[PDB]
């Protein structure tokens, strides 16, 4: 059950005036593609706060990657879901190397200790196999991101939806034949040259807990089949994520504002904001 929104004063949306004319803002299966200018964050914040939404953010920081946690977490505090309940889940082989980062009210962090083929499967296995009941009890949505990143601008409830992927920044303007999908028919991640909507990045996906566990379970199973068959997909769990999102369409797609590499790709005019970016 959803209570009424309060009275709000904001500019009238204009039917005969698009917010963005330069980019595709809805997929052919009627999922919004999230770009700056397409959303009124005040309306969305109201909708999600009225449901007392809790967002879980999962991040793996193994071996040398623990060094990235301080900037990752400090910038998440500035930019990620501010105002909403947030639970960080840091999966690491070095619990003691996790920095003590000061968190805003309503936000918490849990450190989860973890122990080549298993390493590739680790993340999908952890989210679907071991953390299943925990997540269902603790959060409404799960977001899975890479640690060697920093938030530079708002990343908020505009992304939340049953299932989302993010446009890989190297491929958003590419033809599908150029996408680095797995191309060997012997792999469960196989996608033919005449299929594919988008190339999604493994570094940022999520959705409701139920849908994220479905995705990670399916990818983990597919990866185990490939292992048994002596094959490893070209881009590992990203190849499987792409296969899954081809066959189970996401209910939102995030624009490359949400996954960018400024050193490699600059700041094109089509990106009004750079929200979550690679660390040089």
Swiss-Prot record:
Coiled-coil annotated spans: none
An annotated GO BP: protein glycosylation
Sorted UniProt keywords: Blood group antigen, Glycoprotein, Glycosyltransferase, Golgi apparatus, Manganese, Membrane, Metal-binding, Secreted, Signal-anchor, Transferase, Transmembrane, Transmembrane helix
Effect of residue 149 to T/V: Alters substrate specificity so that both UDP-N-acetyl-D-galactosamine and UDP-galactose are utilized
Highest taxon of the lineage: Eukaryota
Binding positions for UDP-N-acetyl-alpha-D-galactosamine per the UniProt entry: 60-62, 65, 146-148
Pathway: Protein modification; protein glycosylation
Binding locations of Mn(2+): 146, 148
Keyword Repeat among record annotations: no
Origin organism lineage: Eukaryota, Metazoa, Chordata, Craniata, Vertebrata
Descriptive protein name: Histo-blood group ABO system transferase
Modified how: The soluble form derives from the membrane form by proteolytic processing.
Active site: 238
Tissue distribution: Expressed at high levels in testis. Also expressed in pancreas, uterus and lung and salivary gland.
One Gene Ontology term, aspect cellular component: Golgi apparatus
Residue range from the parent sequence: 64 to 345 of 354
EC number(s) reported in the record: 2.4.1.40, 2.4.1.37
Example GO molecular function: manganese ion binding
Cofactor: Mn(2+)
Cofactor note: Binds 1 Mn(2+) ion per subunit.
Subcellular location: Golgi apparatus, Golgi stack membrane; Secreted
Effect of residue 169 to A: In allele B(A)
Catalytic activity: an alpha-L-fucosyl-(1->2)-beta-D-galactosyl derivative + UDP-N-acetyl-alpha-D-galactosamine = an N-acetyl-alpha-D-galactosaminyl-(1->3)-[alpha-L-fucosyl-(1->2)]-beta-D-galactosyl derivative + UDP + H(+); an alpha-L-fucosyl-(1->2)-beta-D-galactosyl derivative + UDP-alpha-D-galactose = an alpha-D-galactosyl-(1->3)-[alpha-L-fucosyl-(1->2)]-beta-D-galactosyl derivative + UDP + H(+)
Domain notes: The conserved DXD motif is involved in cofactor binding. The manganese ion interacts with the beta-phosphate group of UDP and may also have a role in catalysis.
Topological relation to the membrane, as annotated: Single-pass type II membrane protein
Positions annotated to bind an alpha-L-fucosyl-(1->2)-beta-D-galactosyl derivative: 168, 180, 238, 261
Family of the protein in this entry: Belongs to the glycosyltransferase 6 family.
């Amino acid at each position: 059950f959803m209570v009424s929104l309060p009275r709000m004063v904001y500019p009238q949306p204009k039917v005969l005036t698009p917010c963005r004319k330069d980019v595709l803002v809805v997929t052919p299966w009627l999922a919004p593609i999230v770009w700056e200018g397409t959303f009124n964050i005040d309306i969305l914040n109201e909708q999600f706060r009225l449901q007392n939404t809790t967002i879980g953010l999962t991040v793996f920081a193994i071996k040398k990657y623990v060094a990235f946690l301080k900037l990752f977490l400090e910038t998440a505090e500035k930019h990620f879901m501010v105002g909403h309940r947030v639970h960080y889940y840091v999966f690491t082989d070095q619990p003691a190397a996790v920095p003590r980062v000061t968190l805003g009210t309503g936000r918490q962090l849990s450190v989860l200790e973890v122990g080549w083929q298993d390493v590739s499967m680790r993340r999908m296995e952890m989210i679907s196999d071991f953390c299943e009941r925990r997540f269902l009890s603790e959060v409404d949505y799960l977001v899975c991101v890479d640690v060697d990143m920093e938030f530079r601008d708002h990343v908020g409830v505009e992304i939340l939806t049953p299932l989302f992927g993010t446009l890989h920044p190297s491929f958003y303007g590419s033809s599908r034949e150029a996408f680095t999908y797995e191309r060997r028919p012997q792999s469960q991640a196989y996608i033919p040259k005449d299929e594919g909507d988008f190339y999604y990045m493994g570094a940022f996906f999520g959705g409701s807990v139920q849908e994220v566990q479905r995705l990670t379970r399916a990818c983990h199973q597919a990866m185990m089949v490939d292992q048994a068959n002596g094959i490893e997909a070209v881009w590992h769990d990203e190849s499987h994520l792409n296969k899954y999102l081809l066959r189970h369409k996401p209910t939102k797609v995030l624009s490359p504002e949400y996954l960018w590499d400024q050193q490699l790709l600059g700041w094109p005019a089509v990106l009004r904001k750079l929200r979550f970016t690679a660390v040089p």
